[PDB]
Amino acid sequence: GCCSTPPCAVLYC
């Protein structure tokens, strides 16, 4: 998931 990963969670997940 792109939510549980900091680099992508900066976007908005």
Side-chain angles (χ1 to χ4, degrees):
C2 230
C3 293
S4 184
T5 170
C8 182
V10 184
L11 297 164
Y12 189 42
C13 189

